[PDB]
Design an enzyme around this catalytic site. Sequence first.
Site, PDB file in Angstrom:
ATOM      1  N   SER A 243     -33.914 -40.435 -82.046  1.00 57.52           N
ATOM      2  CA  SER A 243     -34.495 -41.390 -81.112  1.00 57.52           C
ATOM      3  C   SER A 243     -35.272 -40.660 -80.023  1.00 57.52           C
ATOM      4  O   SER A 243     -36.218 -41.200 -79.451  1.00 57.52           O
ATOM      5  CB  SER A 243     -33.394 -42.243 -80.480  1.00 57.52           C
ATOM      6  OG  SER A 243     -32.691 -42.981 -81.465  1.00 57.52           O
ATOM      7  N   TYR A 246     -38.999 -40.353 -79.752  1.00 56.55           N
ATOM      8  CA  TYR A 246     -39.717 -41.580 -79.435  1.00 56.55           C
ATOM      9  C   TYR A 246     -39.867 -41.784 -77.934  1.00 56.55           C
ATOM     10  O   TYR A 246     -40.452 -42.770 -77.485  1.00 56.55           O
ATOM     11  CB  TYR A 246     -39.011 -42.776 -80.072  1.00 56.55           C
ATOM     12  CG  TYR A 246     -39.129 -42.788 -81.578  1.00 56.55           C
ATOM     13  CD1 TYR A 246     -40.348 -43.030 -82.194  1.00 56.55           C
ATOM     14  CD2 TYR A 246     -38.032 -42.522 -82.385  1.00 56.55           C
ATOM     15  CE1 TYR A 246     -40.472 -43.008 -83.570  1.00 56.55           C
ATOM     16  CE2 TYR A 246     -38.147 -42.494 -83.762  1.00 56.55           C
ATOM     17  CZ  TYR A 246     -39.369 -42.740 -84.348  1.00 56.55           C
ATOM     18  OH  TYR A 246     -39.490 -42.717 -85.717  1.00 56.55           O
ATOM     19  N   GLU A 327     -31.280 -44.580 -90.392  1.00 54.99           N
ATOM     20  CA  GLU A 327     -32.171 -45.532 -89.743  1.00 54.99           C
ATOM     21  C   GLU A 327     -31.692 -46.956 -90.002  1.00 54.99           C
ATOM     22  O   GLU A 327     -31.825 -47.472 -91.111  1.00 54.99           O
ATOM     23  CB  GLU A 327     -33.588 -45.337 -90.288  1.00 54.99           C
ATOM     24  CG  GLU A 327     -34.663 -46.188 -89.644  1.00 54.99           C
ATOM     25  CD  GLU A 327     -36.045 -45.830 -90.155  1.00 54.99           C
ATOM     26  OE1 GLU A 327     -37.030 -46.473 -89.736  1.00 54.99           O
ATOM     27  OE2 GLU A 327     -36.145 -44.898 -90.980  1.00 54.99           O
TER      28      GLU A 327
HETATM   29  C1  LIG Z   1     -46.535 -49.898 -84.297  1.00 53.26           C
HETATM   30  C2  LIG Z   1     -45.092 -49.385 -84.347  1.00 53.26           C
HETATM   31  C3  LIG Z   1     -44.954 -48.085 -85.181  1.00 53.26           C
HETATM   32  N1  LIG Z   1     -43.582 -47.499 -85.268  1.00 53.26           N
HETATM   33  C4  LIG Z   1     -43.080 -47.099 -83.917  1.00 53.26           C
HETATM   34  C5  LIG Z   1     -41.672 -46.462 -83.978  1.00 53.26           C
HETATM   35  C6  LIG Z   1     -40.662 -47.425 -84.635  1.00 53.26           C
HETATM   36  C7  LIG Z   1     -39.302 -46.752 -84.771  1.00 53.26           C
HETATM   37  N2  LIG Z   1     -38.775 -46.354 -85.945  1.00 53.26           N
HETATM   38  C8  LIG Z   1     -37.542 -45.796 -85.655  1.00 53.26           C
HETATM   39  C9  LIG Z   1     -36.551 -45.223 -86.452  1.00 53.26           C
HETATM   40  C10 LIG Z   1     -35.359 -44.721 -85.862  1.00 53.26           C
HETATM   41  C11 LIG Z   1     -35.176 -44.804 -84.455  1.00 53.26           C
HETATM   42  C12 LIG Z   1     -36.180 -45.388 -83.618  1.00 53.26           C
HETATM   43  C13 LIG Z   1     -35.923 -45.441 -82.148  1.00 53.26           C
HETATM   44  N3  LIG Z   1     -36.858 -46.029 -81.391  1.00 53.26           N
HETATM   45  O1  LIG Z   1     -34.918 -44.975 -81.614  1.00 53.26           O
HETATM   46  C14 LIG Z   1     -37.362 -45.885 -84.221  1.00 53.26           C
HETATM   47  N4  LIG Z   1     -38.508 -46.496 -83.726  1.00 53.26           N
HETATM   48  C15 LIG Z   1     -41.183 -47.876 -86.028  1.00 53.26           C
HETATM   49  C16 LIG Z   1     -42.628 -48.428 -85.949  1.00 53.26           C
END
Ligand SMILES: CCCN1CCC(c2nc3cccc(C(N)=O)c3[nH]2)CC1
Length: 350
Positions: A243, A246, A327
Amino acid sequence: KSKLPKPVQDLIKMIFDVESMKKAMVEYEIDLQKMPLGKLSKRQIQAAYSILSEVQQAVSQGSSDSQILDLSNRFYTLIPHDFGMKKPPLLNNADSVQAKVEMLDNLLDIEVAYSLLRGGSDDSSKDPIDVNYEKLKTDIKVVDRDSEEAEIIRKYVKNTHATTHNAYDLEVIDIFKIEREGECQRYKPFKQLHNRRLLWHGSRTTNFAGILSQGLRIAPPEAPVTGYMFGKGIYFADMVSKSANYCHTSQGDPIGLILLGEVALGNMYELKHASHISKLPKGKHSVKGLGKTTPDPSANISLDGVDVPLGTGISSGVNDTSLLYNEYIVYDIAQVNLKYLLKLKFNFKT
Ligand SMILES: CCCN1CCC(c2nc3cccc(C(N)=O)c3[nH]2)CC1
């Protein structure tokens, strides 16, 4: 003056920082002279999503230039950029669309944040700190540095922090026990569903203002299905190192935020490869992308019925999966109940 604790007040200062918003847009070469924060609109963003959507659809068909060329300009006209000189990046591939689709998401949260920040209390009866705290609609308490929870969480941040993506080190500066207004009653029903995990969730700092305000939402239909590996939905994880990627932090911006929301997954629909859906089989209630690595299951703990996979990272049963980290995806905003919010600090080794 403010009665809230210093640590909380500081939190209220970064989530409502305008410089952070502008800096966020500048990274996207968004000429702030054509699109100020007060120029942002939700109606404008949706119109953009539709375009990106029309783009992806075009690529999947083979519009063969022209149509894509004009369809590309139709975007940069709606979302003012400043590439200086070259050739405005033609959106003629999934990768380009995904990047753009990611920009709108953040720009949307920034638009929401810029709105709240400027509500209807511009007086001085109450200081900005205590005022903005209200707009969040989320009671926030600080978790003592030496307590059961703190230890559990911090220990959950240490173990799940492998050495692979160890281009940095995490340090739990602050730990908050949040709880948005309503996520209690809305989560009560689904609370009666076995398999409730305490997963991680990371996002750009400039989005938490909208997160606590709106709550983890599910991408709208106008938005491109591209980018998501399991369709529109809320994604989590059990590896804090998954995470973290991100929070989009860096050597210049080491401080980032991350969430720990309780989620009732129920019967999971285990998948090893990407599969856009959003219509789980009759019986399932969530999706789980099998990864190569997973928290040591034997060292897993569970409290109040909620499972906390705070086990050290190890190899999973199968390695024949494109995902190296688990995930979990839920397709109902009512299945998530944000619990904590960590103010982590990234330390890169370089
Ligand atoms: C336009 C959006 C694109 N994309 C952005 C990130 C999204 C996303 N996929 C993930 C898989 C595991 C953890 C997290 C987390 N935020 O903690 C995730 N956020 C999935 C979609």
